[PDB]
Enzyme design. Structure first.
Site, PDB file in Angstrom:
ATOM      1  N   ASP B  12       0.797  -1.216   0.000  1.00 61.97           N
ATOM      2  CA  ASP B  12       0.000   0.000   0.000  1.00 61.97           C
ATOM      3  C   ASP B  12       0.838   1.279   0.000  1.00 61.97           C
ATOM      4  O   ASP B  12       0.336   2.364   0.324  1.00 61.97           O
ATOM      5  CB  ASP B  12      -0.941   0.002   1.202  1.00 61.97           C
ATOM      6  CG  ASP B  12      -1.897  -1.178   1.200  1.00 61.97           C
ATOM      7  OD1 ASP B  12      -2.473  -1.473   0.127  1.00 61.97           O
ATOM      8  OD2 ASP B  12      -2.066  -1.805   2.274  1.00 61.97           O
ATOM      9  N   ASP B  62      -7.023  -6.024  -4.212  1.00 60.11           N
ATOM     10  CA  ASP B  62      -7.864  -5.759  -3.051  1.00 60.11           C
ATOM     11  C   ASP B  62      -8.714  -4.525  -3.303  1.00 60.11           C
ATOM     12  O   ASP B  62      -8.375  -3.424  -2.865  1.00 60.11           O
ATOM     13  CB  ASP B  62      -6.992  -5.544  -1.821  1.00 60.11           C
ATOM     14  CG  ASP B  62      -7.818  -5.272  -0.585  1.00 60.11           C
ATOM     15  OD1 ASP B  62      -9.061  -5.378  -0.670  1.00 60.11           O
ATOM     16  OD2 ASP B  62      -7.218  -4.956   0.458  1.00 60.11           O
ATOM     17  N   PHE B  63      -9.806  -4.708  -4.031  1.00 59.32           N
ATOM     18  CA  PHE B  63     -10.618  -3.585  -4.460  1.00 59.32           C
ATOM     19  C   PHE B  63     -11.945  -3.456  -3.699  1.00 59.32           C
ATOM     20  O   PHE B  63     -12.763  -2.587  -4.025  1.00 59.32           O
ATOM     21  CB  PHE B  63     -10.869  -3.678  -5.975  1.00 59.32           C
ATOM     22  CG  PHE B  63      -9.652  -3.424  -6.827  1.00 59.32           C
ATOM     23  CD1 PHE B  63      -8.447  -3.024  -6.280  1.00 59.32           C
ATOM     24  CD2 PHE B  63      -9.739  -3.565  -8.204  1.00 59.32           C
ATOM     25  CE1 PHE B  63      -7.351  -2.794  -7.089  1.00 59.32           C
ATOM     26  CE2 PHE B  63      -8.648  -3.321  -9.022  1.00 59.32           C
ATOM     27  CZ  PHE B  63      -7.456  -2.937  -8.467  1.00 59.32           C
ATOM     28  N   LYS B  64     -12.153  -4.321  -2.704  1.00 57.29           N
ATOM     29  CA  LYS B  64     -13.314  -4.216  -1.821  1.00 57.29           C
ATOM     30  C   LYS B  64     -14.580  -3.968  -2.654  1.00 57.29           C
ATOM     31  O   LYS B  64     -15.380  -3.069  -2.359  1.00 57.29           O
ATOM     32  CB  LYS B  64     -13.124  -3.051  -0.825  1.00 57.29           C
ATOM     33  CG  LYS B  64     -11.859  -3.104   0.042  1.00 57.29           C
ATOM     34  CD  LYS B  64     -12.085  -4.014   1.231  1.00 57.29           C
ATOM     35  CE  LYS B  64     -10.958  -4.010   2.261  1.00 57.29           C
ATOM     36  NZ  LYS B  64      -9.580  -4.000   1.671  1.00 57.29           N
ATOM     37  N   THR B  71     -22.176  -2.974 -12.325  1.00 60.18           N
ATOM     38  CA  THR B  71     -20.920  -2.260 -12.174  1.00 60.18           C
ATOM     39  C   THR B  71     -19.834  -3.216 -11.663  1.00 60.18           C
ATOM     40  O   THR B  71     -18.685  -3.148 -12.101  1.00 60.18           O
ATOM     41  CB  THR B  71     -21.101  -1.033 -11.264  1.00 60.18           C
ATOM     42  OG1 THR B  71     -22.016  -0.130 -11.902  1.00 60.18           O
ATOM     43  CG2 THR B  71     -19.782  -0.321 -11.007  1.00 60.18           C
ATOM     44  N   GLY B 173      -4.762  -7.357   9.398  1.00 61.57           N
ATOM     45  CA  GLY B 173      -4.821  -6.830  10.749  1.00 61.57           C
ATOM     46  C   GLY B 173      -3.702  -7.344  11.639  1.00 61.57           C
ATOM     47  O   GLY B 173      -3.747  -7.172  12.859  1.00 61.57           O
ATOM     48  N   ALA B 176       0.625  -4.092  12.695  1.00 62.68           N
ATOM     49  CA  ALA B 176       0.209  -2.719  12.957  1.00 62.68           C
ATOM     50  C   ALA B 176      -1.133  -2.613  13.709  1.00 62.68           C
ATOM     51  O   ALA B 176      -1.259  -1.859  14.672  1.00 62.68           O
ATOM     52  CB  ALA B 176       0.166  -1.928  11.654  1.00 62.68           C
ATOM     53  N   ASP B 180      -1.849 -11.038  16.131  1.00 63.34           N
ATOM     54  CA  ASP B 180      -0.667 -11.871  16.309  1.00 63.34           C
ATOM     55  C   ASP B 180      -0.540 -12.879  15.174  1.00 63.34           C
ATOM     56  O   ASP B 180      -1.494 -13.578  14.860  1.00 63.34           O
ATOM     57  CB  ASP B 180      -0.769 -12.633  17.628  1.00 63.34           C
ATOM     58  CG  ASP B 180       0.441 -13.498  17.891  1.00 63.34           C
ATOM     59  OD1 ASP B 180       1.472 -12.937  18.304  1.00 63.34           O
ATOM     60  OD2 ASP B 180       0.346 -14.734  17.714  1.00 63.34           O
TER      61      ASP B 180
HETATM   62  O1  LIG Z   1     -27.313   2.296  -4.799  1.00 59.70           O
HETATM   63  C1  LIG Z   1     -26.459   2.420  -5.835  1.00 59.70           C
HETATM   64  C2  LIG Z   1     -25.324   3.389  -5.803  1.00 59.70           C
HETATM   65  C3  LIG Z   1     -24.620   3.671  -7.039  1.00 59.70           C
HETATM   66  O2  LIG Z   1     -23.639   4.572  -7.014  1.00 59.70           O
HETATM   67  N1  LIG Z   1     -25.139   3.270  -8.260  1.00 59.70           N
HETATM   68  C4  LIG Z   1     -24.471   3.332  -9.505  1.00 59.70           C
HETATM   69  O3  LIG Z   1     -25.097   4.509 -10.180  1.00 59.70           O
HETATM   70  C5  LIG Z   1     -25.070   4.093 -11.600  1.00 59.70           C
HETATM   71  C6  LIG Z   1     -26.373   3.595 -12.168  1.00 59.70           C
HETATM   72  O4  LIG Z   1     -26.310   3.553 -13.567  1.00 59.70           O
HETATM   73  P1  LIG Z   1     -27.533   3.107 -14.473  1.00 59.70           P
HETATM   74  O5  LIG Z   1     -28.382   4.333 -14.729  1.00 59.70           O
HETATM   75  O6  LIG Z   1     -28.371   2.019 -13.718  1.00 59.70           O
HETATM   76  O7  LIG Z   1     -26.820   2.620 -15.792  1.00 59.70           O
HETATM   77  C7  LIG Z   1     -23.816   3.263 -11.731  1.00 59.70           C
HETATM   78  O8  LIG Z   1     -22.623   3.921 -11.905  1.00 59.70           O
HETATM   79  C8  LIG Z   1     -23.789   2.454 -10.503  1.00 59.70           C
HETATM   80  O9  LIG Z   1     -22.592   1.885 -10.117  1.00 59.70           O
HETATM   81  C9  LIG Z   1     -26.216   2.308  -8.409  1.00 59.70           C
HETATM   82  O10 LIG Z   1     -26.739   1.984  -9.592  1.00 59.70           O
HETATM   83  N2  LIG Z   1     -27.035   2.001  -7.179  1.00 59.70           N
HETATM   84  O1  LIG Z   2     -10.798  -6.196   7.356  1.00 58.64           O
HETATM   85  C1  LIG Z   2      -9.885  -5.652   6.541  1.00 58.64           C
HETATM   86  C2  LIG Z   2      -9.693  -6.116   5.137  1.00 58.64           C
HETATM   87  C3  LIG Z   2      -8.594  -5.548   4.399  1.00 58.64           C
HETATM   88  O2  LIG Z   2      -8.365  -6.015   3.165  1.00 58.64           O
HETATM   89  N1  LIG Z   2      -7.572  -4.905   5.071  1.00 58.64           N
HETATM   90  C4  LIG Z   2      -6.451  -4.245   4.496  1.00 58.64           C
HETATM   91  O3  LIG Z   2      -5.295  -5.182   4.607  1.00 58.64           O
HETATM   92  C5  LIG Z   2      -4.149  -4.278   4.810  1.00 58.64           C
HETATM   93  C6  LIG Z   2      -3.623  -4.146   6.218  1.00 58.64           C
HETATM   94  O4  LIG Z   2      -2.379  -3.498   6.210  1.00 58.64           O
HETATM   95  P1  LIG Z   2      -1.604  -3.281   7.560  1.00 58.64           P
HETATM   96  O5  LIG Z   2      -0.828  -4.538   7.841  1.00 58.64           O
HETATM   97  O6  LIG Z   2      -2.572  -2.911   8.703  1.00 58.64           O
HETATM   98  O7  LIG Z   2      -0.654  -2.106   7.184  1.00 58.64           O
HETATM   99  C7  LIG Z   2      -4.505  -3.047   4.016  1.00 58.64           C
HETATM  100  O8  LIG Z   2      -4.239  -3.046   2.673  1.00 58.64           O
HETATM  101  C8  LIG Z   2      -5.941  -2.864   4.272  1.00 58.64           C
HETATM  102  O9  LIG Z   2      -6.694  -2.147   3.364  1.00 58.64           O
HETATM  103  C9  LIG Z   2      -7.576  -4.505   6.472  1.00 58.64           C
HETATM  104  O10 LIG Z   2      -6.500  -4.022   7.109  1.00 58.64           O
HETATM  105  N2  LIG Z   2      -8.742  -5.005   7.285  1.00 58.64           N
END
Ligand SMILES: O=C1CC(=O)N([C@@H]2O[C@H](COP(=O)(O)O)[C@@H](O)[C@H]2O)C(=O)N1
Ligand SMILES: O=C1CC(=O)N([C@@H]2O[C@H](COP(=O)(O)O)[C@@H](O)[C@H]2O)C(=O)N1
Lengths: 218, 217
Positions: B12, B62-64, B71, B173, B176, B180
């Site tokens: 990161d 890791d894009f959550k 989408t 987790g 940092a 453990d």
């Molecule tokens: O509750 C949600 C939140 C969100 O941001 N959006 C998004 O808002 C857009 C909806 O687009 P569309 O009009 O259904 O093509 C997209 O960019 C989605 O990712 C969603 O559709 N519902």
């Molecule tokens: O429950 C979550 C999920 C997650 O992916 N992560 C992430 O995992 C990493 C933790 O890094 P760090 O060891 O605390 O520096 C980061 O990239 C965070 O975004 C998190 O710390 N807790």
């Protein structure tokens, strides 16, 4: 609150730079506020924000649904604002510390956070819906001023508006393709978000003008 | 998924030069790198291919992922196009959103990891109370890869109970945030380290130390 032309926000989720630019350009006379999400950003880079600012007179909302731990959220917000986004959308479900992390960066950097409360898709009913009122109340308590809520559930959108009050700013996706009604949605939302209904139209400009005619009295 | 030393680097850092140097410094200890938005949004999606070229490591994006199904599909497609081997998806937005990701993963020869409970204090407000149900949803959907919190070993144990011994479980987790390494590996297949390694004066020595502490595992 941001002055959104025609109460209309374009969700530019095309993944081709040439197409994204063409379509955005075509509806430029109708829309000064563009929501850029990960479909476009992950395909073309954060510099797409810079290109949109250069080419259009448009506000940029980075729809990144920020949903990490506070430390990572902070970094995501810093990178996003550095790139020229006016605002960022953050999920509320990971809790108050994660939201506060985003608020703090936005305050430091002179930008805005939008808090996503309930979502518009069927799956939102499983977990998010039950947390949504509390997520919104948390937003109010944290001082959040900008919110996102679902056009597909008018009763829920109405409740969200109540919680956040009339002074808060509320934008709503799910209109058009997902079945939400523009007019009814604008009863509660300040602005409505359109993606596919506009960007997949044979004539995006005609689609935008048509939506506008449909809500002209509002 | 065979993770060298049960250790995954969370890269990161937000500068290409630093990210590449530090990863190089610990390459002998890992073969799996988690790349997230801090690095991607700072340096671009091309960084994924660069990591593969330099290190041959596997890459977990890791894009959550936490959008609507339509989408989510697009996000996974763009991510796998960039060379990611796996992507991390939130379960909280529901089954349809997870299924969208599963579809693309299958199409492109990749894996989905389902994030069930998070490690930070805010996870207690909303996520924790849904986490068991999210895990069962994963099982129902045929998810085989999961993420759960090192900071709450009792919760991590419960997640392991739900998903079974066959499922693959990774855990952040550690270090940092207070978790453990040894205790976490009681339940997780692999542990994730970001700051304890990449902010270390000597990242290689930091990794060596961690490995020493879990060598019997
Ligand atoms: O509750 C949600 C939140 C969100 O941001 N959006 C998004 O808002 C857009 C909806 O687009 P569309 O009009 O259904 O093509 C997209 O960019 C989605 O990712 C969603 O559709 N519902
Ligand atoms: O429950 C979550 C999920 C997650 O992916 N992560 C992430 O995992 C990493 C933790 O890094 P760090 O060891 O605390 O520096 C980061 O990239 C965070 O975004 C998190 O710390 N807790």
């Amino acid at each position: 609150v941001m002055d959104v032309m025609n109460r209309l926000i374009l969700a530019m989720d095309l993944m081709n730079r040439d197409d994204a630019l063409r379509v955005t350009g075509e509806v430029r006379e109708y829309i000064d506020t563009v929501k850029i999400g990960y479909p476009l950003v992950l395909s073309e880079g954060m510099d797409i924000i810079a290109e949109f600012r250069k080419r259009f007179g448009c506000r940029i909302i980075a729809d990144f649904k920020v949903a990490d731990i506070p430390e990572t959220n902070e970094k995501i917000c810093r990178a996003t604002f550095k790139a020229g986004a006016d605002a960022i959308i953050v999920h509320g479900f990971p809790g108050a510390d994660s939201v506060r992390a985003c608020l703090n960066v936005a305050e430091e950097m002179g930008r805005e956070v939008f808090l996503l409360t309930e979502m518009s898709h069927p799956g939102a009913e499983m977990f998010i819906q039950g947390a949504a009122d509390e997520i919104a109340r948390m937003g109010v308590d944290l001082g959040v001023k900008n919110y996102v809520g679902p056009s597909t559930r008018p009763e829920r959108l109405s409740r969200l508006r109540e919680i956040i009050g009339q002074d808060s700013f509320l934008i709503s996706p799910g209109v058009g393709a997902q079945g939400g009604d523009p007019g009814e949605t604008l009863r509660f939302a300040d602005a409505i978000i359109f993606g596919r209904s506009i960007y997949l139209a044979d004539n995006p400009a005609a689609a935008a003008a048509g939506i506008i005619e449909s809500i002209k009295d509002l």
